[PDB]
Each structure stands twice: as structure tokens, then as C-alpha cells.
Design a protein around this motif. Structure first.
Motif, PDB file in Angstrom:
ATOM      1  N   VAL C 159       0.903  -1.117   0.000  1.00 31.74           N
ATOM      2  CA  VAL C 159       0.000   0.000   0.000  1.00 31.74           C
ATOM      3  C   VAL C 159       0.951   1.177   0.000  1.00 31.74           C
ATOM      4  CG1 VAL C 159      -1.698   1.484   1.379  1.00 31.74           C
ATOM      5  CG2 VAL C 159      -1.857  -1.014   1.399  1.00 31.74           C
ATOM      6  N   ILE C 160       0.645   2.189  -0.885  1.00 24.68           N
ATOM      7  CA  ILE C 160       1.439   3.397  -1.012  1.00 24.68           C
ATOM      8  C   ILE C 160       0.453   4.535  -0.855  1.00 24.68           C
ATOM      9  CG2 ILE C 160       2.680   4.939  -2.559  1.00 24.68           C
ATOM     10  CD1 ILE C 160       3.615   1.779  -3.512  1.00 24.68           C
ATOM     11  N   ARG C 161       0.832   5.537  -0.024  1.00 23.11           N
ATOM     12  CA  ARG C 161       0.119   6.686   0.264  1.00 23.11           C
ATOM     13  C   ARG C 161       0.992   7.830  -0.071  1.00 23.11           C
ATOM     14  NH1 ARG C 161      -1.463   4.929   6.395  1.00 23.11           N
ATOM     15  NH2 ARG C 161      -2.739   3.055   5.881  1.00 23.11           N
ATOM     16  N   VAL C 162       0.401   9.022  -0.437  1.00 20.57           N
ATOM     17  CA  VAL C 162       1.083  10.219  -0.881  1.00 20.57           C
ATOM     18  C   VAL C 162       0.764  11.244   0.120  1.00 20.57           C
ATOM     19  CG1 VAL C 162       0.749  12.054  -2.634  1.00 20.57           C
ATOM     20  CG2 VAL C 162       1.709   9.874  -3.286  1.00 20.57           C
ATOM     21  N   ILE C 163       1.868  11.957   0.492  1.00 20.55           N
ATOM     22  CA  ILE C 163       1.873  13.013   1.456  1.00 20.55           C
ATOM     23  C   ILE C 163       1.553  14.235   0.658  1.00 20.55           C
ATOM     24  CG2 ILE C 163       2.887  14.035   3.430  1.00 20.55           C
ATOM     25  CD1 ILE C 163       5.226  11.928   3.172  1.00 20.55           C
ATOM     26  N   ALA C 164       0.366  14.785   0.934  1.00 20.61           N
ATOM     27  CA  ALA C 164      -0.147  15.900   0.196  1.00 20.61           C
ATOM     28  C   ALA C 164      -0.497  17.051   1.086  1.00 20.61           C
ATOM     29  CB  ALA C 164      -1.386  15.543  -0.630  1.00 20.61           C
ATOM     30  N   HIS C 165      -0.320  18.298   0.543  1.00 20.33           N
ATOM     31  CA  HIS C 165      -0.143  19.497   1.327  1.00 20.33           C
ATOM     32  C   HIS C 165      -0.989  20.616   0.754  1.00 20.33           C
ATOM     33  CE1 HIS C 165       3.553  17.409   2.637  1.00 20.33           C
ATOM     34  NE2 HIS C 165       4.026  18.443   3.288  1.00 20.33           N
ATOM     35  N   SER C 166      -1.781  21.264   1.644  1.00 17.27           N
ATOM     36  CA  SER C 166      -2.707  22.351   1.327  1.00 17.27           C
ATOM     37  C   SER C 166      -2.037  23.664   1.034  1.00 17.27           C
ATOM     38  CB  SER C 166      -3.858  22.583   2.341  1.00 17.27           C
ATOM     39  OG  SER C 166      -3.408  22.652   3.691  1.00 17.27           O
ATOM     40  N   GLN C 167      -2.456  24.325  -0.084  1.00 10.53           N
ATOM     41  CA  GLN C 167      -2.147  25.712  -0.296  1.00 10.53           C
ATOM     42  C   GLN C 167      -3.079  26.594   0.481  1.00 10.53           C
ATOM     43  OE1 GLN C 167      -1.430  25.345  -5.013  1.00 10.53           O
ATOM     44  NE2 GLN C 167      -0.709  27.309  -4.116  1.00 10.53           N
ATOM     45  N   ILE C 168      -2.718  26.891   1.731  1.00 12.65           N
ATOM     46  CA  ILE C 168      -3.486  27.777   2.554  1.00 12.65           C
ATOM     47  C   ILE C 168      -3.391  29.222   2.130  1.00 12.65           C
ATOM     48  CG2 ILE C 168      -3.606  28.698   4.937  1.00 12.65           C
ATOM     49  CD1 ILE C 168      -4.597  26.070   5.774  1.00 12.65           C
ATOM     50  N   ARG C 169      -2.261  29.668   1.524  1.00 12.50           N
ATOM     51  CA  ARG C 169      -2.084  31.041   1.111  1.00 12.50           C
ATOM     52  C   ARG C 169      -3.159  31.552   0.174  1.00 12.50           C
ATOM     53  NH1 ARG C 169       4.492  30.091   1.201  1.00 12.50           N
ATOM     54  NH2 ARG C 169       5.117  31.679   2.804  1.00 12.50           N
ATOM     55  N   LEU C 170      -3.768  30.634  -0.623  1.00 14.89           N
ATOM     56  CA  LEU C 170      -4.878  30.929  -1.484  1.00 14.89           C
ATOM     57  C   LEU C 170      -6.137  31.237  -0.747  1.00 14.89           C
ATOM     58  CD1 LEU C 170      -4.380  28.558  -4.687  1.00 14.89           C
ATOM     59  CD2 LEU C 170      -3.290  30.817  -4.116  1.00 14.89           C
ATOM     60  N   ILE C 171      -6.275  30.885   0.549  1.00 13.93           N
ATOM     61  CA  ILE C 171      -7.424  31.182   1.381  1.00 13.93           C
ATOM     62  C   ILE C 171      -6.948  32.261   2.290  1.00 13.93           C
ATOM     63  CG2 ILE C 171      -9.093  30.301   3.038  1.00 13.93           C
ATOM     64  CD1 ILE C 171      -8.564  27.483   1.860  1.00 13.93           C
ATOM     65  N   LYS C 172      -7.790  33.318   2.433  1.00 19.74           N
ATOM     66  CA  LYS C 172      -7.408  34.452   3.296  1.00 19.74           C
ATOM     67  C   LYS C 172      -7.635  34.238   4.762  1.00 19.74           C
ATOM     68  CE  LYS C 172      -6.011  36.585  -0.433  1.00 19.74           C
ATOM     69  NZ  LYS C 172      -6.676  37.799  -0.996  1.00 19.74           N
TER      70      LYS C 172
END
Lengths: 205, 124, 364
Positions: C159-172
Motif C-alpha cells: 500500500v502506497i500513500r502520498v503526502i499531500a499538502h494544502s495551499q493555505i495562502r490561497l485562502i485568506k
RNA sequence: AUGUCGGCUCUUCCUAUCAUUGUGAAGCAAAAUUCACCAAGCGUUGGAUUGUUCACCCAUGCAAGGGAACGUGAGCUGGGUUUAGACCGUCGUGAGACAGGUUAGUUUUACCCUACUAAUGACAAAACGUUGUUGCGACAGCAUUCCUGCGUAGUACGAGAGGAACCCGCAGGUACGGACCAAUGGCACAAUACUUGUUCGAGCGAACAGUGGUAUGACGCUACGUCCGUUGGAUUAUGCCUGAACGCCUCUAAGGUCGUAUCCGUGCUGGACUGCAAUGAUAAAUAAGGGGCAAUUUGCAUUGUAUGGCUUCUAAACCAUUUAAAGUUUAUAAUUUACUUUAUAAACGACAAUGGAUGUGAUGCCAAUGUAAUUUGUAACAUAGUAAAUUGGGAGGAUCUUCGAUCACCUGAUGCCGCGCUAGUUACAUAUAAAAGCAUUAUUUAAUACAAUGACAAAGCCUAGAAUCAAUUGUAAACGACUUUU
RNA sequence: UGGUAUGCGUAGAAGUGUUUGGCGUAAGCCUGCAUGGAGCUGCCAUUGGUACAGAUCUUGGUGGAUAGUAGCAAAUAAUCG
RNA sequence: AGCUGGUUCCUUCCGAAGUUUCCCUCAGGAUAGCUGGUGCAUUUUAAUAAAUAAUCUUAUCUGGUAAAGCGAA
């Protein structure tokens, strides 16, 4: 390893009856023999699949009502079912018994360094010898999956992988063993330092 | 004297959840530190190297009040005075010192040291 | 022994107790739709943020419902789903104790809000995470580290999972603390899963790839935390009649002299809110394009139906209350989602194939 | 001094199962109900009267099953029972009685301990620190319920009267549970307006009427509002195969199949306080040094091993199984990925054997040609015959495990330290050994060997974090804490 | 308390703290060490207000509850300074 | 106060009874029985038996239960 005799006895849980094995092992731990028990899914317990299923289901009925997390751990794994059987036979409430439990290691489906290790038989524990003909018996790993052991699927793949590494090592071992016996046999007669000790031993090896 | 002291974040420096700022107590300990420093200057003790090596606080004799309570009960309301004690010391250099070893004579003992050394090869 | 006499329904299901305050806002899946070999090499999940709730109108189809050819007006949720950046890959081996991650392998360049997570004191921090791991990329590469690690993942990792990351800068939202999740790659072939992940390092993955209009999604949030509350509000126990000496809002009776025992099962004052919960079968109204700008300055027609024509965007007059510029890629969900204002909710692929014909309706 | 009864509230279980599931009976044709089973997973209600459980009625729903902890008065109520006031009937000379009716009649205390509910969390343990991030899932809890309409349907079924609202399939609702505040509804910002009484000279704008009243009323909360509640196996009941006992026959004896609202997982919920994994930075900055690889390497030290070299030890290693005629193998002839498959011939025919060692890559306790609390050193002969080092490239392996930025294998290349040589037989020389002791075990050793740990001053390599508090957010909250921050 | 050891004693009595050493089955004893300051004990007989853990004991002192938990909250209640 | 509570050091040795009778007795006494202590007289049951006490057996009496009977009262 270093022991009064061998500090690690790797025991094959195949065709052992669960309580017969547990009791002899409990003695060994108290004696300081520090044993590791492998393939507890291959462990058998007598009494039909169904009869065992209902016996094991009776304990999960047992549940500390107030906070059931104080309440009895209904250990799914065959390794942990073996572990419960040994633990009950040992006075685990004493600090001596804690030492004895620490001496014991229990694994389902023989991993790490234990596979190039010889799985020793305990012949009292042997189901085939002790158990009467035509008596139906249960296999603990079957029982385990009914009461909710997740890893029945998991171990079966890990065991197959292990068996395959264990096959190639066997094949080379048998090839090597031929070539070791010829290399003794051919130098043996060709002077006398093998004729001297083998035939003065002359027993039956 | 943990309870029912609620909780302060600022005691996580000292690894314990429960802190208070008990201001009146801290002021009296301050006064007595300054007394000891004042005494230290008189003795000509080095100011920089003063470390507190002892504080011992023991309980002083209670002053007695009594408050008057429901159902004609009288039950005591008492003040707690203290005996505070402090000692300041100068920081000392690492004191070692040395002890003996009253060992061996004997039969296998003379033969221990003397054979094991003398006619024995000592591998590197 | 008097009975209950009238057999009553036990106030509050035992299957959400013992009600303790949530540790990780980044919802931990308990469950993923396997990896059924053949199919896409796409991320099961995305992290979105609540923008709030809009209200909506559509014509409802279902054969034979009498909701037919009549319009139905439905509560809505609006989640800000700005394109997630794939920053890593973890592969897991099933061992008889459980799934063990062997390896996390990282993108050369981790971009500040991806680092912010790793620090609770940013202005005193030297920012030195991940200097030496990015220095794997200077040296020899996969002949001393990076591809040797990835190879190990190919070799076994089931099983392989991907570490994924939010662009918070796009939300004020003033947070800046973008949130880390591991998201399972359903992708047919283990070897392909790692390869698409290597490629996806420092690359953004849009909401549109994983998800589709009128798909069944699970929305998974921490709930609204709302204090130490009363027994009556929490377990929904009937308020003791006003004749009650010294405090009407209790549970009268813990129980029974024998056993000498407070049971858990008795309605008590303890935490009502701040609970991870997974609710399942929430349909997509719209996947909304935030887009933007060639020379003609778009954000045009995000609130648009073929029937409305009237441009603008999903943003209500005066930007969504507490939240609210909402400039972005969105998933518009069928109306009540777990989790408060400003909260992290993870949007998920439905575990199983819903033949439940309300969805598979393609609603317009 | 163990707080009566009921009713309110709230708990969990039990069946001897009314309903619901799956089923077997029927003098069950349909419909319907009755009986019995696995089954308590899930329902078992709203009222009139009674203090009333009980009872008696009314209404709906397919169905309004029965019990256990005399449950439950620091939970209530104190209504009946059961005090001091009281009235009446009866009885009694009277006082006074009545387990006879009737009426009014203080429900005290938790802040302790445990349990529980929620809320913080240290140390050490260290199958390899710190801290942060990310995860696993042990184990415990566990939940969805039922109907109706459409549909099967005027059909099956029935001589008729009627008649499966019957699974596929479809839509809705109910009861329960959990969410969510957009709409709609509820609340009041003591917001804004209006209004009364008073006060500020009047006015504006306010203040006071402990939120003055009234109409509207947002950020926000919250309803009656709305949204969401998974899927298999095991197998019970049960229907069954094949088939003996009983030539036969048979669901059963052996073997074998399907099968519950059950059970157990999936799922859902706490998250093993430290059970465990993964990964990152790994300081302190230089007038300093600090840590790190230290698994290290040296004087030296500590500790275990073997303890009189060593009187040890072993993470190669007797399969892959149905299994009690079950079975371990070899070889020839075929066959295979598989001690697999086929025919012939034999074989350890659960013997005694075998179970310690074939030490099964033939260990040790050997090397040591004097084998040892010294090490042996040095000569020959002939046979069998040994090897010391380095670098590059190509592919491979890892299940709680003593270093997954680690350890192999193979293949090619480089040269030359000749460093070791062993066994056999045989030469030459010698220290230990002569440890006094004739009683040598007794207080019972350690040169050495191997493994780990240490660190004084010093020495040989590498690298330059953050956490928490303050201040800060509101997504959070009694306080810590959580989530954000500079 | 009578007698006695021509008893002990401010050069430290009695008292008392005491991992001092020892005696006795025990009741209990002696001694050391520290503290102390003014008086005291062994033995044989002789008399008792004669030995304590308690009595919902008495009287004085002291804990855990709890350096703080109840609380110190009605009449708004200050506040600039 | 016949009731309740408590009664102040130790060791050694021996060691009960809840039964009898009478009592406005029946939550208690007295009384007898059981208990210890103090001793005394003699030991062929005593100091360097031809005298018993009380248990078997034997010999010699008694009895109306078990069983049996009702074609014995």
C-alpha cells in the motif's frame, strides 16, 4: 542462544495441541529455557472447528460492564491465544511470573531470523501421537479468524513469501550436502586419518 | 501542596502542570535574600558566586481567630505564620579526595599475582 | 424489582463513547476503498476547508418518485479545495501486527507553509528542516539514497500513500498552517503508484481529477466543540419537572444499589463536541472553477447555471460569514457536513458502489 | 437506623419470542391467525381514571410479549401508606383506639475516596536519545429500525366471497442515533427605532425605572428545520448430497453443500498515556566548544562470558500436507515450478532403532607436533592439500527487529606482503608445570579469550536543532490543554 | 516507707532522643552516645490513688480533608485620579 | 440499672458451660452438674494382693422397639 542449555528454542507450533504445548513450555520458562514459538496458526486444538468456535465465543460474552476497557482482552491472534494459554498456567500476578513471560516470545508464521533456524518438535505436544484416530480437531488460525482476527489473510501471504526463501535455501543446502559427503569419502581411504577415527568409533554415527 | 490549585501553563518550564503566582510569599523571600546579600558584603563574600544552598521553611505558631457559622457553630479561622531560613554560599571548585585498599596475602593468593605475572606471557 | 414498565429507547448510542476531545484535525481515515487493480492511480482524498453554506434549487428526477419534474430546494455546503501539492510518498508493508511504513521520501523543495507544520515557533526558528534531505539531491541521487529508498518501496510495500499538502495562502484564513495528510493511491500496480508519486513531487493535483459531479463522497471532520455542557443537552435526557429541589437539569437516577457500580452507559456531563466523525453519502452539486484572468479578468460565472446566466460567483454578498473570500476550486456538497467554520475536513471517495438510485442521478 | 409504594427520570440484562429476521407444524387453499425453533440485534407506545404497580377503558400501529438488580427519596415528588392540627362512622364509662374513610402537614449534607464522566500529564522503560511531524491498530464499545404506497395485483391461490401491497425493482415516512444554522422558525446586541414616567434650562444626544416597556432585530447560538446512518463470512435453526450401520434403504455414523434481524469482522467510535513504526532538524556558535559515528581506537576503569585455554557453543538445519494402513526416500523409465506426477524394483515396514548431533556449509575442547590461571619455539620426509589484500560495475534481499543513506552475491580489473600453512610420521630444545601438599578444594582464584559499557587530562573522524512559557488566534476552552501567530 | 549497700551524685543527678552493645520466652533491664542541670537508685521486708489503646471515655494538642477544596456571592458598584 | 459499653503488666500450668430445679421466673439469680485451687488419709491402688476403681468378657436378670402378625386378643 547462551543457556542452561539453549536460550532460544524455536518450537514448531505445527501439529501441536495448544494446551499440551502451553504446559510443557510453561515449565521450560520457569526452568529458564526461554522459548520462542513460531507458526501458531498451524497450532491445533482438539474438538471440532465448530465446537471450538462456540467455546471461544463464550469468552467474548464476558465483558466488565462499567468500563469494559478494564474488562477482559479477547485476544484474536493465534499467537496471542497461545500466549493466553501459557500465561494462565504461569502465576502472572507474581514478579517471578513477569520474568517468565518475558522469556517467552510468540509469533504467527515464523519470521526474522527464525526461519533459517530449526523449529524443534516437542513430542508430548504432538497432536498426531497423543490424539486418538478419527477424532476431529480444530486449527487455531481458523478459530482466530471467526472471533475477528484480521491478519489471517496477511500471515498467509507472509508465510508463502517465507516458504519461498526457505525453498531456495533448502535446495542449495541439499546440493551442498552431497558435495560435502563425497569430499570426506574420497580422501578417507586415501591415507588413513579418516579410517582411524571413524572405524575406532565404529558405532553407527 | 497540590490541590485544589488549578493550572498554569508557565510551570511546564519546571515540567509540572500546576503553577501559581503566590505574590505575598515571594516578596518576603525576596527581603530575606537581600538581607543575606547585605550580610555577604559585610563578610566580603564574592557577590557573583552566591548561590542559595539552603532554604528551609517550617511552620510558626498559629494566631487564632474564630468565625461564627450556621446553626450556632463556631469553628476556627487561623493564620499561618512561617519560620523561613536561607543560607547563601560561594561556588566551590570540584573536591576529590582518596581512600585505600587493604588486600591480599595467601596460599593461592601469593601464587595468583606472582605466577600470573612472572612466568606467564602477557599477550598484548 | 420494578421494570422500566414502559420499555424506552436508550438516550444516546454507545458507539460514539467515550466522547474525548480530538487530537488531530487532519482526519485519519479508518478506511480506504482498497487498490482494485486496473484503475486510475488517483488520490482517494483531498483536504478542504469550510466556506459555509449557500442554499440551491434543482429539478428532481428519480423513477417513480412523485418529486418528479418538480423543483426541490436543498441546503448546501461550500468547501474551499485549493490544489493540493504532492510533497512525498510513504509505502507500507502489512506485518501480522499491522501496516508499517518503511520509507518516507521527500520532494527537493518544501515550500514554507509545508515547513510551518513542523514548527510551533516560526519567528524564533532557523527554518533548518529539511536542509540535509534536500542535500541527498545534490549527491549521487538514487545510488546513495533517493531511488534506493523508492526501490525498496517498489520491492515490497503493498500500500502506497502520498503526502499531500494544502495551499493555505490561497485562502485568506490567517492560519498559514497548511495541513499534512497521507492519501491512498488506489492505483493498479504498486510500481506505477510510486512512479506517479515521483513525478508528482512539487506538482499540484486539482480537485477535478479525483472527483466528479454527483459522486458519492464522505466528509470527515472534527465536530463543533462547545464546552463542558449539561447532561440534558449532551445525551438528550428529558428535563426533570420544575418541582425539582436544587437543579432541574440532571439525570435523576444513575441506577441501582446492587451492583455497587456506576455504569458508563448512564448519561453523564462530559465532552459534547470536538469529535472525529465520518458521515457517508454526500453527493456533489458542482465542482466549481475558481479559474482567473487572461487580460479579461474572469472569476466569472462560478454561481452560474444554464438557467441563471448571471455571472458573479458562489460568494454571497459580503463574503461568507467568518470565512469568506472563497476565490478557488470548490466542491459543492449536498448540505450538512461535519465540522465547524474554518475547520479542516477531508473529502473522500465512498467505500462502496451505491446502487441507491438517488445517487446515481445526474442532477442539473 | 440498610431511606416504604407508586409515578416522574435513567440503566443493563434475561427469556419461558407478541412483533421484526431466517425457519420447521397446521384439520394454513387465498387472506389470516395459531404452534414450535435459532434468536433479546430491534420494538413493546399516546391518553381518561386511580396514589396505585396491578387494574379498567379509549385511540393508532403488522405488533402495543413477560421477567431480574422489594433499582432508583445527599434525584424529584411526598400523592397513598405512616407522627404532631383536624372531621366522621364504629367501639368505648372515659381517656383513647381503628392495619376504616377524610383533610393540612420542614425531603438535611459531597468540596473526601472509588467508580464514572470529561480535563492535564512527569519519570523511568529503552529490542538503540531529543524534539517535532506523520502513522499503525492492539484492545474495548458498536446500531440502524419498521411500515406503507406504487409494484408483484384483481394475478398467483380460490367453486365463490375474495386475494398474497408478496422477495426483484421503486418512492416516501416512522422510530432511534449522529451531524449541520443556508432557508424557515426560536432567542436578545440592553443594536436601532418608537413610547411612557423622570432627570439633563429647553433642544440634540443620552442617563435613571437593577435589560423600563413596545416593534424590528443582525455577528452568534439553536429548534419544530434540514442532511447522513456500510458490507461480507462463520454458521444456528433448517432444507440438503453422497453413504453405511441394517447386502438393501436412508440428511449422518465418516466425509460433504446452502443457510439468521445471530455472531464476528468490514464499517463506525475511544486510541495501547510512554505498545510500536516511519521520517526531519538534530543544537547551544567560536573568546567556544558542544554533540555525533562511537559500532570506535589508546593509558585506565566498570560489568557479563568462560571461570583453571575452553571444565564451551550454535539467529545453517530432517519437507509441503490431508493424516493413524495415515507415511520418510532412492534409483531406473517418463514428468515437474513444486522430495510434484506416473509405472516397475526396493527401502528407515509409528520395532529395538531412533532423538542429540550426521554438530548434519560434518562444531566443538581445535590451532596447540608439551592441549595451557605461559605460550610451545625451532629440523626433516613424503602424501592429501591450504591461500593473505584491494578497487570498479551489474542485479537482490528486510513480518516486534541488536544500525533498511544497511548487509550480500556474481562478474571483471589491479597488482604483490608470500602474512598464515594444517593433518600424518619423525628430529632438536625448553620456560609453565615441582600451586609445600602429603589433608590440595575451601574464604576457593584468574594471565588470557569473546561481548558490552565507561570516561579522567589527551589523541585520531562529522555537524551546526528546537521545545515550552510570555505576547497572539477562535476554528478552542472552567483552568491546563487544543488550534493559529509573530 | 523501715532497714541497708561506711550506695550514686552538680568532676553532672533525675529526666529524655537515640541503627550503641548485650541480657531474659516475656513482663522488661542495663549500658553507650547526645541533651541536661539538682538531685537520685539497687537489695530485703513494709503500703497503695500501682502499669492503659480503647470506655458515642475525660482534658489538652495535632493531621488528611485543605495553603486550600466550602467559601468570603443578595442591596448593580465601581471608576479617573 | 438484672441493661450497654469499657476495665489498666506478663509468663507458666490446669481448664468450662449454655444443662437440672425453683423463682411475676423466661435478657437474671439461687441450686445441682461440669471447673480450678487448697489439701488430707492410704498406697502391695508408696516412696530405698487374698484391697479397689471401672471398661471388655463371662454368668445371671430386665425390656415391647426394629422386624413380624391379623386364617392371634
Amino acid at each position: 542462544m547462551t543457556g542452561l542449555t539453549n536460550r532460544t528454542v524455536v518450537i514448531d507450533g505445527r501439529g501441536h495441541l495448544l494446551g499440551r504445548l502451553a504446559s510443557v513450555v510453561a515449565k521450560y520458562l520457569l526452568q529458564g529455557g526461554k522459548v520462542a514459538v513460531v507458526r501458531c496458526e498451524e497450532l491445533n486444538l482438539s474438538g471440532h472447528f465448530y465446537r471450538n468456535k462456540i467455546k471461544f465465543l463464550a469468552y467474548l460474552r464476558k465483558r466488565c460492564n462499567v468500563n469494559p476497557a478494564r474488562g477482559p482482552f479477547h485476544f484474536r491472534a493465534p499467537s496471542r491465544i497461545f500466549y493466553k494459554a501459557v500465561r494462565g498456567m504461569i502465576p502472572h500476578k507474581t514478579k517471578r511470573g513477569q520474568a517468565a513471560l518475558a522469556r517467552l516470545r510468540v509469533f504467527d508464521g515464523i519470521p526474522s531470523p527464525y526461519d533459517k533456524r530449526r523449529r524443534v518438535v516437542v513430542p508430548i505436544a504432538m497432536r498426531v501421537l497423543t490424539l486418538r484416530s478419527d477424532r476431529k480437531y480444530c486449527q487455531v488460525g481458523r478459530l482466530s479468524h471467526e472471533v475477528g482476527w484480521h491478519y489471517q489473510d496477511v500471515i498467509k501471504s507472509l508465510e508463502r513469501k517465507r516458504k519461498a526463501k526457505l525453498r531456495v535455501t533448502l535446495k542449495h543446502n541439499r546440493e551442498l550436502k552431497k558435495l560435502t559427503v563425497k569430499a570426506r569419502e574420497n580422501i578417507a581411504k586415501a591415507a588413513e586419518p579418516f579410517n582411524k577415527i571413524i572405524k575406532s568409533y565404529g558405532y553407527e554415527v | 501542596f497540590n490541590g485544589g490549585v488549578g493550572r498554569c501553563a508557565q510551570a511546564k518550564q519546571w515540567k509540572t502542570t500546576q503553577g501559581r503566582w503566590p505574590k505575598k510569599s515571594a516578596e518576603f523571600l525576596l527581603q530575606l535574600l537581600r538581607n543575606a546579600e547585605a550580610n555577604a558584603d559585610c563578610k566580603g563574600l564574592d557577590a557573583d558566586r552566591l548561590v542559595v544552598h539552603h532554604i528551609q521553611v517550617n511552620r510558626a505558631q498559629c494566631l487564632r481567630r474564630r468565625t461564627y457559622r450556621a446553626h450556632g457553630r463556631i469553628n476556627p479561622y487561623m493564620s499561618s505564620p512561617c519560620h523561613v531560613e536561607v543560607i547563601l554560599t560561594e561556588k566551590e571548585e570540584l573536591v576529590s579526595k582518596a581512600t585505600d585498599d587493604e588486600p591480599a596475602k595467601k596460599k593461592l593468593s601469593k601464587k595468583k599475582l606472582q605466577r600470573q605475572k612472572e612466568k606467564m606471557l602477557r599477550s598484548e | 424489582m420494578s421494570h422500566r414498565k414502559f420499555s424506552a429507547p436508550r438516550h444516546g448510542s454507545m458507539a460514539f463513547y467515550p466522547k474525548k476531545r480530538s487530537a488531530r484535525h487532519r482526519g485519519k481515515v479508518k478506511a480506504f476503498p482498497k487498490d482494485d487493480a486496473s484503475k486510475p492511480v488517483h488520490l482517494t482524498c483531498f483536504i478542504g476547508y469550510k466556506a459555509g453554506m449557500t442554499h440551491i434549487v434543482r429539478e428532481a428526477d428519480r423513477p417513480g418518485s412523485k418529486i418528479n419534474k418538480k423543483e426541490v430546494v436543498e441546503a448546501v455546503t461550500v468547501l474551499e479545495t485549493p490544489p493540493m501539492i504532492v510533497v512525498g510518498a510513504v509505502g507500507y508493508i502489512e506485518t501480522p501486527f499491522g501496516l508499517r511504513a518503511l520509507v518516507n521520501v521527500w520532494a527537493q523543495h518544501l515550500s514554507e507553509e509545508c515547513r510551518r507544520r513542523f514548527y510551533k515557533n516560526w519567528y524564533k526558528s532557523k527554518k533548518k528542516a529539511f536542509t540535509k534531505a534536500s542535500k541527498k539531491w545534490t549527491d549521487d541521487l538514487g545510488k546513495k539514497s533517493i531511488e534506493n529508498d523508492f526501490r525498496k518501496m517498489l520491492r515490497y510495500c503493498k500500500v502506497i500513500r502520498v503526502i499531500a499538502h494544502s495551499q493555505i495562502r490561497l485562502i485568506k484564513q490567517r492560519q498559514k498552517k497548511a495541513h499534512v495528510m497521507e492519501i491512498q493511491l488506489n492505483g493498479g500496480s504498486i510500481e506505477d503508484k510510486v512512479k506517479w508519486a515521483r513525478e508528482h513531487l512539487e506538482k499540484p493535483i486539482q480537485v477535478s481529477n479525483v472527483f466528479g459531479q454527483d459522486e458519492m463522497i464522505d466528509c470527515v471532520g472534527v465536530t463543533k466543540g462547545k464546552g463542558f455542557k449539561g447532561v440534558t443537552s449532551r445525551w438528550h435526557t428529558k428535563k426533570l419537572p420544575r418541582k425539582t429541589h436544587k437543579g432541574l437539569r440532571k439525570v435523576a437516577c444513575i441506577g441501582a444499589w446492587h451492583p455497587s457500580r456506576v455504569s458508563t452507559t448512564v448519561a453523564r456531563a462530559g465532552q459534547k463536541g470536538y469529535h472525529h466523525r465520518t458521515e457517508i453519502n454526500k453527493k456533489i452539486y458542482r465542482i466549481g472553477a475558481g479559474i482567473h484572468t487572461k487580460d479579461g479578468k474572469v472569476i466569472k460565472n462560478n454561481a452560474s447555471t444554464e438557467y441563471d446566466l448571471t455571472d458573479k460567483s458562489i460568494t454571497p454578498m459580503g463574503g461568507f460569514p467568518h470565512y469568506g473570500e472563497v476565490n478557488n476550486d470548490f466542491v459543492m456538497i449536498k448540505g450538512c457536513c461535519i465540522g465547524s467554520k474554518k475547520r479542516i475536513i477531508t473529502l473522500r471517495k465512498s467505500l462502496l458502489k451505491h446502487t441507491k438510485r438517488s445517487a446515481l442521478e445526474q442532477i442539473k
